[PDB]
Design a protein around this ligand. Structure first.
Ligand SMILES: NC(=O)c1ccc[n+]([C@@H]2O[C@H](COP(=O)([O-])OP(=O)(O)OC[C@H]3O[C@@H](n4cnc5c(N)ncnc54)[C@H](O)[C@@H]3O)[C@@H](O)[C@H]2O)c1
Ligand SMILES: NC(=O)c1ccc[n+]([C@@H]2O[C@H](COP(=O)([O-])OP(=O)(O)OC[C@H]3O[C@@H](n4cnc5c(N)ncnc54)[C@H](O)[C@@H]3O)[C@@H](O)[C@H]2O)c1
Ligand SMILES: O=c1ccn([C@@H]2O[C@H](COP(=O)(O)OP(=O)(O)O)[C@@H](O)[C@H]2O)c(=O)[nH]1
Ligand SMILES: O=c1ccn([C@@H]2O[C@H](COP(=O)(O)OP(=O)(O)O)[C@@H](O)[C@H]2O)c(=O)[nH]1
Lengths: 335, 339
């Protein structure tokens, strides 16, 4: 039995499927800022027998009363905290919005959790907490520093979780530092459907592929990388979902960080070419300047996760691209 | 013709600052939730301010109460905001970190948002030497590394970072970040001073309260630091010097974009030294319980003063003796604080 904040969205939807298919119950709260209820309807159907163990509500985490209402009806062995804004670039323009949504929402959540005595937390952290790492790959023990508000909200929240742990050892906390999840369920029945203009690379590429967007703008061509463009560790969202069930087993340790990545670094152009390969479509590119807040090279050391959580990323880039295209092809306009 | 909103204004440092603002021609609205103060402070500031008291209103308002805060901003135009509101005990923060992140950061963000909403983008922020962490540099300069070692310290470091990001997003903003060291003392009239609710957390308000019978001893947090006497060293500054530094800050604001100034004296004093100076001023004995360190306390912390002297044209004028003198003056006539 779990509470999934942000469960209508990209990673949480997929993860809810896995929870259901692992025999878990799940309550979702989401305010549909960057998702819709249609994603969870589908997940309900696709999970088949086990769909009646999913329930979901439109709730903002900053709305303490409505969130308290949730915690009063059901009890949770755990909370998976997906909810928040996630765009580096946006956050530089709109820092207050990021600090508002992410910190106020998280703090509200953590306080409600204490009040109703649920103190097991799995948190969506981000590789962004490594800033511009001087050394790669990025280990869980390497310096944490951020270079933009979004990264800061994740670093600060990690720091808040540490302090709560230190304050009270009833808490069991796992900080999952996701790198760059891409792809879709292999059925193509569910996948990434961001609302408003997209910010992440691959959902922007999928929209270019079906004509919903005219070009991908490439943020930077003068980086110290193989091809001048940014490098990241892209990991299939279905692998990431399975990393959550792993983290839940692990909880039964106090306050632990685990990277979730593949351990390979892929450039932007590489990912585009891998997408063109999987889709047969051509993605027009605009080479522009760097996006304020972006790191250069960032990829995971996956070894702590591999050994501690007994979890590996299985899918490679071609699998990520095939599943993504399969979703996009069969759902060009989303849910 | 200059109007200021003062958060946490009923509190210790805000109280005294508000009075100087009134005395220096400013007008002022205070919002405060009375978590660590009472309205008596501000009643007495009205009296102490004379006719200038007539330019002060105060309202019971939590900064996290957005409707209430927006009300405040829609009823008055503000040329600037001095943000004092917050919880401030290092030790309390370690025990109760959510309370701290909540009150300090939800507080601050909500105000920042309302300020932007109403087009008032001139901020003076109450930061702290605790952003210097357990430092390797002494003296601690505005260019020296920052890093907290406890939740309270983090709220201040984080909020500074938030203000930097707001400045970066939006060049209309003018923010001065004041790193106060350890303010002590009271108005020389002795008619106002520090009065926390419940058990005091700061050194000298605890000491005052021991001196007048209200607490049985001072618990000295660590006698095994690597200092003259093994107790913590800090830069204690007269709250009135501190107050005046805010008039200086408010002036610099009409020049500068997001700018850090230390407010201290640049001398380091031990806990036992401050105890000794207070016994000398008050003529009362302070019983001492020698205990272990307080989670998250620095060893030695004291200020660089060069930047503030140069750029705010501000320097402490009062010494430890005055600090204890005015503290005792306040405490002797007001042993249980305000009524
Ligand atoms: N997607 C990535 O590449 C990536 C990488 C690292 C970390 N993360 C983090 O993982 C989490 C999930 O990201 P995602 O890719 O699934 O994005 P997403 O936007 O699809 O998921 C976030 C969900 O949270 C909801 N939400 C936002 N603010 C809310 C609020 N105040 N109350 C309730 N619900 C709210 C949105 O409606 C959305 O469904 C986020 O915290 C993100 O920062 C994502
Ligand atoms: N006293 C020190 O040594 C010291 C040192 C460095 C920094 N500071 C900072 O200076 C500021 C003033 O400190 P002080 O010594 O006057 O403390 P104080 O406790 O006397 O003043 C703070 C005031 O804020 C009010 N308040 C708290 N949370 C509030 C909220 N959410 N909404 C409205 N009002 C709220 C309290 O009721 C109190 O009146 C604080 O930000 C503190 O962190 C103090
Ligand atoms: O429209 C876009 C979005 C992303 N990127 C690049 O793709 C990588 C991953 O971007 P995304 O925003 O998905 O992830 P992040 O690493 O910022 O979390 C980075 O090098 C970005 O510069 C890009 O060139 N164009
Ligand atoms: O009851 C107390 C309060 C404070 N201190 C010490 O006095 C100094 C000033 O502490 P305070 O909490 O007043 O200010 P801080 O420097 O923590 O902001 C520090 O070395 C504290 O360890 C102490 O020994 N006992």
């Amino acid at each position: 039995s779990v509470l999934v904040t942000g469960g209508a969205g990209y990673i949480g939807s997929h993860t809810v499927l896995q929870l259901l298919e692992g025999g878990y119950s799940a309550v979702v709260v989401d305010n549909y800022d960057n998702s819709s209820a249609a994603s969870l309807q589908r997940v309900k159907k696709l999970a088949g027998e086990n769909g009646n163990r999913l329930s979901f509500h439109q709730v903002d985490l900053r709305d303490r009363p409505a969130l308290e209402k949730i915690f009063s009806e059901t009890k949770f062995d755990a909370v998976i905290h997906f909810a928040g804004l996630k765009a580096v670039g946006e956050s530089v323009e709109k820092p207050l919005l990021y600090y508002n949504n992410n910190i106020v929402g998280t703090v509200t959540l953590l306080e409600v959790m204490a009040q109703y005595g649920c103190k097991n937390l799995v948190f969506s952290s981000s590789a962004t907490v490594y800033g511009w790492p001087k050394e790669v790959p990025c280990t869980e023990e390497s310096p944490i520093s951020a270079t933009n508000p979004y990264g800061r909200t994740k670093l600060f929240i990690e720091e808040i979780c540490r302090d709560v742990h230190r304050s009270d050892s009833e808490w069991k906390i796992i900080l999952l530092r996701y790198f760059n999840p891409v792809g879709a369920h292999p059925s193509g029945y569910i996948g990434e459907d961001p609302l408003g203009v997209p910010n992440n690379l691959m959902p922007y590429v999928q929209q270019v592929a079906v004509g919903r967007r005219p070009h991908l703008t490439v943020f930077g061509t003068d980086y110290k990388t193989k091809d001048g463009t940014g490098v990241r560790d892209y990991i299939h969202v279905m692998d990431l979902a399975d990393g959550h069930i792993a983290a839940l087993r692990k909880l039964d340790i106090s306050c632990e960080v685990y990277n979730l990545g593949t351990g390979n670094g892929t450039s932007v152009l590489e990912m585009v070419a891998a997408f063109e390969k999987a889709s047969g479509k051509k993605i027009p590119l605009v080479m522009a300047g760097r996006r304020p807040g972006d790191a250069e090279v960032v990829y995971a050391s996956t070894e702590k996760a591999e050994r501690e959580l007994n979890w590996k990323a299985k899918n490679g880039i071609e699998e990520m691209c095939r599943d993504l295209w399969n979703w996009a092809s069969n759902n060009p306009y989303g849910y």
